[PDB]
Design an enzyme around this catalytic site. Structure first.
Site, PDB file in Angstrom:
ATOM      1  N   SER A 180       0.826  -1.576   0.459  1.00  0.00           N
ATOM      2  CA  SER A 180       0.226  -0.062  -0.209  1.00  0.00           C
ATOM      3  C   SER A 180       0.893   1.935   0.049  1.00  0.00           C
ATOM      4  CB  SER A 180      -0.838  -0.071   1.353  1.00  0.00           C
ATOM      5  OG  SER A 180      -1.866   1.161   1.336  1.00  0.00           O
ATOM      6  N   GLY A 181       0.575   2.031  -0.495  1.00  0.00           N
ATOM      7  CA  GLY A 181       1.024   3.184  -0.878  1.00  0.00           C
ATOM      8  C   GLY A 181       2.766   3.443  -2.197  1.00  0.00           C
ATOM      9  N   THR A 185      -1.135   2.042  -8.714  1.00  0.00           N
ATOM     10  CA  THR A 185      -2.794   3.048  -9.248  1.00  0.00           C
ATOM     11  C   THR A 185      -1.402   4.450  -9.787  1.00  0.00           C
ATOM     12  OG1 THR A 185      -3.980   1.970  -7.697  1.00  0.00           O
ATOM     13  CG2 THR A 185      -4.516   3.982  -9.245  1.00  0.00           C
ATOM     14  N   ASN A 231      -2.104   5.483   2.791  1.00  0.00           N
ATOM     15  CA  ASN A 231      -2.061   6.685   0.892  1.00  0.00           C
ATOM     16  C   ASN A 231      -3.233   6.826   1.732  1.00  0.00           C
ATOM     17  OD1 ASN A 231      -2.428   4.540  -1.625  1.00  0.00           O
ATOM     18  ND2 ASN A 231      -2.054   6.791  -1.337  1.00  0.00           N
ATOM     19  N   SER A 234      -6.240   4.971  -0.800  1.00  0.00           N
ATOM     20  CA  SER A 234      -5.816   3.178  -1.106  1.00  0.00           C
ATOM     21  C   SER A 234      -6.922   2.708  -2.007  1.00  0.00           C
ATOM     22  CB  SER A 234      -5.784   3.512   0.692  1.00  0.00           C
ATOM     23  OG  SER A 234      -5.401   1.751   0.347  1.00  0.00           O
ATOM     24  N   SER A 235      -6.263   2.278  -2.530  1.00  0.00           N
ATOM     25  CA  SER A 235      -7.276   1.035  -3.077  1.00  0.00           C
ATOM     26  C   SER A 235      -7.785  -0.523  -2.606  1.00  0.00           C
ATOM     27  CB  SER A 235      -6.574   0.038  -4.903  1.00  0.00           C
ATOM     28  OG  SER A 235      -6.389   1.522  -5.593  1.00  0.00           O
ATOM     29  N   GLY A 451       0.874  -6.816  -3.385  1.00  0.00           N
ATOM     30  CA  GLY A 451       2.088  -7.746  -3.383  1.00  0.00           C
ATOM     31  C   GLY A 451       1.679  -8.058  -2.137  1.00  0.00           C
ATOM     32  N   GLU A 453       2.051  -9.413   2.130  1.00  0.00           N
ATOM     33  CA  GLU A 453       1.485  -8.659   3.034  1.00  0.00           C
ATOM     34  C   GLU A 453       1.704  -9.620   4.581  1.00  0.00           C
ATOM     35  OE1 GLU A 453      -2.341  -7.859   2.686  1.00  0.00           O
ATOM     36  OE2 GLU A 453      -2.381  -6.670   1.705  1.00  0.00           O
TER      37      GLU A 453
HETATM   38  N1  LIG Z   1       5.867   8.300  -9.947  1.00  0.00           N
HETATM   39  C1  LIG Z   1       4.668   9.384  -9.226  1.00  0.00           C
HETATM   40  N2  LIG Z   1       5.253   9.935  -8.706  1.00  0.00           N
HETATM   41  C2  LIG Z   1       4.488  11.449  -7.785  1.00  0.00           C
HETATM   42  N3  LIG Z   1       3.483  10.865  -6.781  1.00  0.00           N
HETATM   43  C3  LIG Z   1       3.456   9.251  -6.757  1.00  0.00           C
HETATM   44  C4  LIG Z   1       4.133   8.713  -7.881  1.00  0.00           C
HETATM   45  N4  LIG Z   1       3.587   7.382  -7.184  1.00  0.00           N
HETATM   46  C5  LIG Z   1       2.921   7.654  -6.187  1.00  0.00           C
HETATM   47  N5  LIG Z   1       2.907   8.546  -5.823  1.00  0.00           N
HETATM   48  C6  LIG Z   1       2.394   8.963  -4.329  1.00  0.00           C
HETATM   49  O1  LIG Z   1       1.330   7.869  -3.854  1.00  0.00           O
HETATM   50  C7  LIG Z   1       0.512   7.590  -3.589  1.00  0.00           C
HETATM   51  C8  LIG Z   1      -0.190   6.501  -3.554  1.00  0.00           C
HETATM   52  O2  LIG Z   1       0.323   6.420  -4.895  1.00  0.00           O
HETATM   53  P1  LIG Z   1      -0.788   4.907  -5.214  1.00  0.00           P
HETATM   54  O3  LIG Z   1      -0.706   4.366  -7.037  1.00  0.00           O
HETATM   55  O4  LIG Z   1      -2.290   5.316  -4.548  1.00  0.00           O
HETATM   56  O5  LIG Z   1      -0.151   3.463  -4.585  1.00  0.00           O
HETATM   57  P2  LIG Z   1      -0.366   2.458  -4.832  1.00  0.00           P
HETATM   58  O6  LIG Z   1      -0.031   1.277  -4.747  1.00  0.00           O
HETATM   59  O7  LIG Z   1      -2.054   2.106  -5.273  1.00  0.00           O
HETATM   60  N6  LIG Z   1      -1.007   1.497  -2.542  1.00  0.00           N
HETATM   61  P3  LIG Z   1      -2.691   1.133  -2.741  1.00  0.00           P
HETATM   62  O8  LIG Z   1      -3.743   1.555  -4.037  1.00  0.00           O
HETATM   63  O9  LIG Z   1      -3.089   1.307  -1.558  1.00  0.00           O
HETATM   64  O10 LIG Z   1      -3.058  -0.521  -2.434  1.00  0.00           O
HETATM   65  C9  LIG Z   1      -0.456   8.783  -5.183  1.00  0.00           C
HETATM   66  O11 LIG Z   1      -1.380   9.534  -4.147  1.00  0.00           O
HETATM   67  C10 LIG Z   1       1.308   9.709  -5.087  1.00  0.00           C
HETATM   68  O12 LIG Z   1       0.827  10.787  -4.195  1.00  0.00           O
HETATM   69 MN   LIG Z   2      -4.453   1.755  -5.294  1.00  0.00          MN
END
Ligand SMILES: Nc1ncnc2c1ncn2[C@@H]1O[C@H](COP(=O)(O)OP(=O)(O)NP(=O)(O)O)[C@@H](O)[C@H]1O
Ligand SMILES: [Mn+2]
Length: 716
Positions: A180-181, A185, A231, A234-235, A451, A453
């Site tokens: 997560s984070g 996404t 996050n 968070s998805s 991934g 956990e």
């Molecule tokens: N390449 C990037 N550039 C800038 N900010 C990023 C980048 N990747 C992630 N972030 C920051 O990190 C936050 C969370 O990334 P996100 O893609 O939502 O994580 P995730 O892996 O989908 N976690 P989750 O959905 O909770 O399992 C985003 O809202 C951005 O603020």
């Molecule tokens: Mn996500």
């Protein structure tokens, strides 16, 4: 000049590849091979140290962070030479131990370079900062290039996938996993956006398929994403998007599959967490007609299901998102009747959680305590108030009683069931919009799930997702095995070992097989007499002797250990039966079925059974069948820290991810063969006291067992 190869990337270059000046300077930095090493550290997993003394058995050194350590020689690990600083593909490193990998990514990240390859893996470390690397100039610069022909970038996976599809006439796959984070996404969106940007246009809801595919996100996110500790967005469900293409890359269709929505969150939040975004989007008051339509105030604290934790989050403007959500539904072709129905049901869940109950004075039985909130729920759900409350108090056949706790429980279970079904229906409806009559040949499937956990508390949910990542890691290992094979065959080296995917069977069998963990869980769900402890007895009775991957729990209470590829995970087993069965008040479900609201009716038309476990197995099978019909590409997202701090990396945290995500796994399985391979003959090698079984001769290259180059470049 020397950087001319970078010119086409414009201002994105400093974030993709460092200049030639910096390159050659880094290479002259002071480096004694024998003195500059990695040693273990308590607080920060590994640390670069300078050797001060030897013991004849032990070694002492000067730690980065200014400390003196004394370790066993066995624990000391060689650094890669400056030649290898910030290497773009980590498979090219001489030393491929844990620190070498960690530090190469740390040095790239320190330099603001977010992308690195590690054999097949594209590795991404969350910058927590917008970087200027997603411009049309960068897109133009990645068009039609091979991996090796450009610096690492998520765009490289995308373009090559699209290109492989056209060239090889073959389905492709992009697997984007991580904690997560980590960035899953963000990268997923870039990848979809990239296809929409480059895909060809096929013969003639609202706008274009490209518009519609992208507008699917704000719709799912409202109902399936939430603020967590890790996050802000968070998805809380896994996602698989197949984008379908025709002959020359004509964008033909798309379909979305969603996995394991977090039903719990609907009715419960931890101190620093929110419910799904939609609740706060609706309450922002941006669309005033919705508060009136939902019979609702603007105050989240008026609603018990949604206000147990956080209510606002600085990074999210809930009002602007409401318009994002509503717009998406318009673009996606949803009618007013369809949009209003989902809003109504969202509001109904809101009122549902405000229904209070009390005990009958002279009986151990629940009755309603006020009925205003019930009235609002019933009106929105197209139900009869009295019938609803009768149903909840006296489920019906034979008629059972209920204390307050039971009714409160039943209320929560029904709200969760309604929310989950609505989310599924919404996904199903978006799929209807994305279906077209256009001809298809191939697809590219994009997978966005958490991934592996390992938490302080691991329950059923953890088993499910860890089971998925086991199959995904096996899928990777199998792919890696086939490639390593083609390679040894092409270069003319006789190599033998068992399929790398097989190394994961024993764990999968323990989970997947008849009389395995899932099977035992589902068999127990057949017995109304069965309990948590009878279930735990049954697993032990079948496995503690018999399956090596099943162990006693290491001493939050756990019941058994599973040895997964990623490590030993302790599982708590309480509530698995209920989690799995999800029993509902059937009298109230009967009312849902007979609702005057078409949506509610639809959501329960097809109703019990199928257990969470069996649904998970059905979905995972579908996933695997698609992925196996595919050329896969592997994207590993890493979160660098706990505090959203850009350019800052916590070593033990990155190390944990590397152990769990396949990067170290891939390194390990290539180690079985001959990993280091260098191009030029046999006389020089035969002229050394060197171990002669450590190398083999190929057509283009000589193949080395790991640690020969370590002793070769050392002698140099
Ligand atoms: N390449 C990037 N550039 C800038 N900010 C990023 C980048 N990747 C992630 N972030 C920051 O990190 C936050 C969370 O990334 P996100 O893609 O939502 O994580 P995730 O892996 O989908 N976690 P989750 O959905 O909770 O399992 C985003 O809202 C951005 O603020
Ligand atoms: Mn996500």
């Amino acid at each position: 000049g020397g950087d001319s190869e970078m010119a086409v990337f414009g201002a994105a270059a400093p974030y993709l590849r460092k200049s030639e000046k910096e390159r050659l300077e880094a290479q002259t930095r002071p480096f004694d091979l024998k003195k500059d090493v990695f040693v273990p550290d308590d607080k920060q997993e590994f640390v670069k140290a300078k050797i001060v003394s030897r013991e004849g058995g032990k070694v002492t050194a000067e730690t980065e962070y200014g400390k003196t350590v004394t370790v066993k020689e066995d624990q000391v690990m060689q650094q890669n030479p400056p030649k290898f600083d910030k290497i773009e593909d980590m498979a090219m490193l001489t030393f491929l131990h844990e620190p070498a990998v960690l530090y190469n990514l740390k040095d790239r990240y320190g330099s603001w370079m977010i992308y690195t390859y590690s054999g097949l893996f594209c590795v991404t470390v969350n910058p927590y900062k917008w970087l200027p690397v997603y411009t049309p100039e960068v897109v133009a610069a990645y068009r039609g290039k091979k991996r090796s022909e450009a610096p690492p970038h998520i765009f490289s996976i995308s373009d090559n996938a699209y290109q492989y599809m056209l060239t090889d006439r073959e389905n492709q796959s992009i697997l984007i996993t991580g904690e997560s984070g980590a960035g899953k996404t963000v990268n997923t969106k870039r990848v979809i956006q990239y296809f929409a940007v480059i895909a060809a246009i096929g013969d003639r809801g609202k706008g274009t398929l490209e518009d519609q595919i992208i507008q699917a996100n704000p719709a799912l996110e409202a109902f399936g994403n939430a603020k967590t500790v890790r996050n802000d967005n968070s998805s809380r469900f896994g996602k698989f998007i197949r984008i379908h293409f025709g002959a020359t890359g004509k964008l033909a269709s798309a379909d979305i599959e969603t996995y394991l929505l977090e039903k719990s969150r609907v009715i419960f939040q931890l101190k620093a967490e929110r419910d799904y975004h939609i609740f706060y989007q609706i309450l922002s008051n941006k669309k005033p007609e919705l508060l009136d339509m939902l019979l609702i105030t603007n105050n989240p604290y008026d609603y018990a299901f949604i206000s147990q934790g956080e209510t606002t989050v600085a990074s999210i403007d809930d009002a602007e998102e409401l318009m994002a959500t509503d717009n998406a539904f318009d673009v996606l072709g949803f009618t007013s009747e369809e949009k209003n129905s989902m809003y109504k049901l969202t509001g109904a869940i809101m009122h549902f959680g405000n229904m209070k109950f009390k005990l009958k004075q002279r009986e151990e039985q629940a009755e309603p305590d006020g009925t205003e909130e019930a009235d609002k729920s019933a009106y929105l759900m197209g139900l009869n108030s009295a019938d609803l409350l009768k149903g909840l108090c006296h489920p019906r056949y034979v008629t059972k009683g209920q204390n307050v706790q039971q009714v409160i429980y039943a209320t929560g279970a029904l709200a969760k069931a309604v929310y989950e079904r609505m989310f599924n229906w919404m996904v199903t409806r978006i799929n209807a919009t994305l279906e077209t009559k256009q001809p298809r040949q191939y697809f590219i499937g994009v997978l966005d799930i958490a991934g592996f956990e390992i938490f302080d508390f691991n329950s059923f949910e953890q088993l499910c997702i860890n089971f998925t990542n086991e199959k995904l890691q096996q899928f990777f290992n199998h792919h890696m095995f086939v490639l390593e094979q083609e390679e040894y065959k092409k270069e003319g080296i006789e190599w033998t070992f068992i399929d790398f995917g097989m190394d994961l069977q024993a764990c999968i069998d323990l989970i997947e097989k008849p009389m395995g963990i899932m099977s035992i869980l589902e068999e127990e769900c057949m017995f109304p007499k069965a309990t948590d402890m009878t279930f735990k007895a049954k697993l032990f009775d079948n496995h503690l002797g018999k399956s090596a991957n099943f162990q006693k729990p290491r001493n939050p209470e756990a019941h058994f250990s599973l040895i997964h590829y990623a490590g030993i995970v302790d599982y708590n087993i309480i509530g698995w039966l209920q989690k799995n069965k999800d029993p509902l008040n059937e009298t109230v479900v009967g009312l849902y079925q007979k609702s005057s609201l078409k949506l509610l009716s639809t959501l329960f038309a097809n109703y019990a059974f199928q257990t969470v476990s069996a649904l998970h197995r059905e979905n995972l099978n579908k996933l695997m069948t698609n992925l196996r019909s595919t050329h896969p590409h592997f994207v590993r997202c890493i979160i660098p820290n706990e505090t959203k701090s850009p350019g800052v990396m916590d070593n033990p945290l990155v190390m944990h991810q590397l152990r769990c995500n396949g990067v170290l796994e891939g390194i390990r399985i290539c180690r079985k063969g001959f990993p280091n391979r260098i191009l030029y003959a046999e006389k020089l090698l035969s002229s050394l006291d060197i171990d002669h079984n450590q190398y083999k001769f190929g057509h283009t290259k000589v193949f080395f067992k790991a640690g020969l180059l370590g002793l070769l470049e050392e002698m140099r």
